[PDB]
């Protein structure tokens, strides 16, 4: 299983980003003992799905803003506030 790092270009629409995040520093980890920010949901045919985001992706950066060590509220505010277009850097396990 390769750990790959991808850029995902999400265009915000009237339906938001079409994703959910779980985790964050100081919260219950989504995956093992890694309390980072993970994609827990992807809205079918939503902006994130069109851009190629997958559930289980770990969010590393948003438009160059690092959120690897963000707590949950920090990541929410970055994802809400920081652009009509969000270029996410994510890490993903690939077969």
């Amino acid at each position: 299983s390769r750990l790959e790092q991808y850029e995902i270009h999400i265009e915000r629409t009237a339906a938001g980003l079409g994703l959910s995040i779980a985790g964050g520093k100081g919260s219950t980890p989504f995956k093992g003992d890694d309390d980072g920010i993970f994609i827990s949901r992807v809205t079918e045919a939503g902006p994130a799905d069109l851009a190629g985001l997958k559930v289980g992706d770990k969010v590393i950066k948003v438009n160059g803003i690092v959120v690897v060590d963000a707590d949950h509220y920090q990541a929410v505010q970055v994802l809400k506030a920081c652009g009509a277009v969000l270029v996410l850097v994510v890490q993903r396990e690939v077969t």
Binding site: L19, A22, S27, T28
Partner: peptide, 8 residues
């Protein structure tokens, strides 16, 4: 610990 999930 909190268990947060936020739809966006």
């Amino acid at each position: 610990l909190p268990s947060f999930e936020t739809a966006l």
